[PDB]
Amino acid sequence: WLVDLTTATQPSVAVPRLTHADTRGRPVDGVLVTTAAIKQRLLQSFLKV
Amino acid sequence: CNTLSLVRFLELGLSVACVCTKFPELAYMNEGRVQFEV
Amino acid sequence: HQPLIARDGPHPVEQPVHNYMTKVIDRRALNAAFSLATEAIALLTGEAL
Amino acid sequence: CFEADIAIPSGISRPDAAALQRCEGRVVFLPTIRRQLALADVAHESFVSGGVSPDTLGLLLAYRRRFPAVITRVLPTRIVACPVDLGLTHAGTVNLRNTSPVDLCNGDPVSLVPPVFEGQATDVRLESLDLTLRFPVPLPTPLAREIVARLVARGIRDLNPDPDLNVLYYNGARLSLVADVQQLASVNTELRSLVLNMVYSITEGTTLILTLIPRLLALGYVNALLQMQSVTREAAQLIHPEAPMLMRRLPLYEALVAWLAHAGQLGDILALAPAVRVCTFDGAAVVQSGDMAPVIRYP
């Protein structure tokens, strides 16, 4: 369910030139704002980073 | 009054793999024969 | 500059519309305020010392 | 003063922009006094109260309810109005646009309905976002109280038919109230509910008093002093009306509050109280139609 929701949209006409890293090299391409209540039961059952 | 009127694009690499052979340069041609001997 | 998969057959020819589309900027308020009592007007200026 | 901003919405045309250039100095009504406002609180479409378009009653309820604001300087992306109702008395001089009478050096002008004059005059419409700004008419206190009681009197002769009420001279001019060709047929259907209010508060009370006072004085300082200042006035009205009309206490005193409840409505409805004053300086003391006037805050 998430993985299509992860890419139902399409990438914008945008290169930031200032990227948010992942401590290795990896650039971040999404945000996924959620509520506090949903984020709890989502993380502990659908692993993790 | 703004930029970002730019997108970029190209497509190769797999564009030769599935093709899985190529003769380039067809000239003024009429008939192409390939015969099989098994 | 959208791609073209320019076709074989006598179906008529593709045509690249490299159109300029515009958008429209909104305007927002974001207002904030804070009180100040009847005293501390002579104060913070230098009157009632 | 405390100037308040009304936000211009999105894409309008240059005649819609020029419509905003023919209104610099009009009168604007608004519900709340938030320092940033939008145009959605302004339009005549924001006057819907029961799902239909308001009448001249339905406007004069709101015209006594919400708050006047006068646009000093027009702007792109904003509307600056220094509102009247804020500020101390006789301060913050503001400038208005006259309509056909004078607005003399005094008079204390009053905002009131458009359809007592030409209805599709001053109903200025925005074409792009498709809204309507029906600006009220600033009339001074004597004539404003004059014309309000004439058309509802003209509504009576238009109600159930069988002099001509419409001449009404000013100090110099002859004021043509009748804009005949298409307005007056729309007049008696846009003051339509309002005439019933001026009537029903008269038919109830007079037919209540003629079964109140005969039920009073014998059911004593108010007794003999009832007709003391009403000698040959109320007994004469008891002689005239009670003869050519018809003639119960527990529904009666129940009707006593209800009529007088409707009476307290109408006093807030009618009589058009002054809100702003013309008392200028170094003017010709006499304003003409289309010319500005320095207007000061409180009556």
| Rounded distance between C-alpha atoms, residue D206 and residue D209, angstroms | 5
Would the CB atoms of C31 and D10 count as touching at under 8 Å? no
Cβ of residue D11 closer than 8 Å to a chain C Cβ: yes
- Contact, D277 vs D297, CB < 8 A? yes
φ/ψ of B37, rounded to 5, equals -125, 105
Number of H helices, E strands in chain A: 2, 0
- Contact, D87 vs D136, CB < 8 A? no
* Other Cβ atoms within 10 Å of D263 Cβ, number: 12
Three-state SS annotation for chain D: CCCEEEECCCCCCHHHHHHCCCCCCCEEEECCCCCEEEHHHCCHHHHCCCCCCCCHHHHHHHHCCCEEEEEEEECCCCEEEEECCCCCCCCCCEECCCCCCCCECCCCCEEECCCCCCCCCCEEEECCCCEEEECCEEECHHHHHHHHHHHHHHHHHCCCCCCCCCCCECCCCECCCCCHHHHHHHHHHHCHHHHHHHHHHHHHHHHHHCCCCCCCCCCCHHHHCCCCCCCCCHHHHHHCCCCCCCCCHHHHHHHHHHHHHHHHHHHHHCCCCCCCEECCCCCCCECCCCCCCEEECCC
Query: Per 3-state DSSP, what percentage of chain A is helix, strand, and coil (rounded to 5)?
Result: 25, 0, 75
| Rounded distance between C-alpha atoms, residue D169 and residue D254, angstroms | 44
Residue of B nearest to A13 (CA): B7
Cβ of residue B28 closer than 8 Å to a chain C Cβ: no
Closest CA to D297 of D283, D281, D279, D284: D279
Q: Report chain B residues whose CB lies below 8 A from the CB of C20.
A: 5
* Contacts of D267 by beta carbon, 8 Å cutoff, 6+ apart: none
Q: Indicate the length of chain C as a whole number.
A: 49
| Rounded distance between C-alpha atoms, residue A26 and residue D87, angstroms | 61
Would the CB atoms of B9 and C1 count as touching at under 8 Å? yes
A26, D10, D264 from C27: Cα distances, Å: 35, 9, 45
* Contacts of D155 by beta carbon, 8 Å cutoff, 6+ apart: D188, D191, D194, D195
| Rounded distance between C-alpha atoms, residue D231 and residue D115, angstroms | 42
Would the CB atoms of D35 and C31 count as touching at under 8 Å? yes
Q: Report chain C residues whose CB lies below 8 A from the CB of B11.
A: 3
Residue given tokens 């945000």 in the structure block:
A31
Instruction: Give the tokens for residue D29.
Output: 């009504």
Q: Report chain A residues whose CB lies below 8 A from the CB of B4.
A: 13-14
- Contact, D105 vs D283, CB < 8 A? yes
Q: Over the range D222-254, which residues count as b (16 or more CB within 10 Å of their CB) and which as e?
A: eeeeebeeeeeeeeeebeeeeeeeeeeeeeeee
Q: What is the DSSP letter of B30?
A: S
Q: Would you call A5 helix, strand, or coil by DSSP?
A: helix
State the resolution, in angstroms.
4.5
Residue of B nearest to A16 (CA): B4
D155, D213, D272 from D209: Cα distances, Å: 25, 6, 27
* Contacts of D67 by beta carbon, 8 Å cutoff, 6+ apart: D29, D30, D31, D32, D33, D83, D85
| Torsion on CA atoms C24, C27, C28, C34, rounded to nearest 10 | 160
In degrees, rounded to 5, the angle at the alpha carbon of residue C20 between the alpha carbons of residues C22 and D129 is: 30
Closest CA to D116 of D82, D80, D149: D149
| Rounded distance between C-alpha atoms, residue D56 and residue D62, angstroms | 10
Chain centroid, CA C11 distance in Å: 43
| Rounded distance between C-alpha atoms, residue D125 and residue D16, angstroms | 8
Closest CA to D85 of D104, D65, D56, D103: D65
Would the CB atoms of C3 and B7 count as touching at under 8 Å? no
| Rounded distance between C-alpha atoms, residue D40 and residue B32, angstroms | 75
φ/ψ of D152, rounded to 5, equals -70, -25
Residue given tokens 């209805």 in the structure block:
D119
Contacting chains of D (3 CB pairs or more, <8 Å) are C
D207, D210, D249, D260 from D256: Cα distances, Å: 11, 12, 10, 6
| Rounded distance between C-alpha atoms, residue D115 and residue D185, angstroms | 11
Task: Please tell me the distance in Å from B1's CA to the nearest CA on chain A.
Answer: 17
